[PDB]
Symmetry: C2
Subunit: 128 residues, 2 copies
């Protein structure tokens, strides 16, 4: 299957209620970081720690729209997408709609997420 499809399969797994929290632990490269809207990095364990809280629960997440996909040579790729989520935090439901830039690399012939930066969650879809 096409690399878009392979990489999209990985992003769908990230955007899943059961798998998001621990995902980077299994699927990310060792030097992966997740860049929060503040600019402050989290590593795979830091990301999982956020979701481990108890106070933060993912209700739904989806790959709403892919804005950019391309291979960067044979063994890397960029995928830019809008991630649409619903989550509960300390007693309130929230919608979240960031723009996310993700980078993938092939390691031992398998695709892994190498980098991800997200925006604040009130993006305007109409601009795409």
């Amino acid at each position: 299957m096409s690399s878009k499809e392979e990489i999209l399969s990985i992003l769908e797994a990230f955007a899943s209620t059961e798998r998001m929290g621990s995902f980077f632990l299994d699927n990310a490269t060792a030097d992966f970081l997740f860049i929060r809207p503040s600019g402050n990095p989290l590593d795979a364990k830091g990301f999982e720690n956020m979701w481990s809280s108890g106070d933060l629960v993912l209700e739904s997440a989806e790959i709403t729209k892919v804005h950019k996909f391309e291979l960067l040579g044979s063994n890397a790729a960029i995928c830019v997408f809008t991630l649409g989520s619903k989550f509960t935090y300390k007693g309130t439901q929230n919608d979240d709609l960031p723009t996310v830039t993700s980078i993938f690399k092939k390691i031992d012939e398998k695709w892994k997420v190498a980098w991800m930066q997200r925006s604040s969650g009130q993006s305007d879809m109409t601009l795409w």
Copy 2:
């Protein structure tokens, strides 16, 4: 010279008081977008329009620290950095310190910026 150095030379030109506004017009690929902290995209002209305002003036900008650099094959690259700027907006000076994820591609044997997403400007350097 090394690709880091070539790509760093391009980023220094972006982070310059005279060149930032119009930079993407000359140095970016046609499908480049700049992702604002909100997640909302700007194209090269949209970016220049912001700086054309009169109300917004860049006083200084620097590549403060490079956190990640690597080639993605022979003809692409990722560079993650903290951009330290001072700017005036509608009568007030501000400091700005985002995390920026940039992607580069070689087009006709020349490096061009292909993508850039920035965070809010109050990142915590101590986390790197």
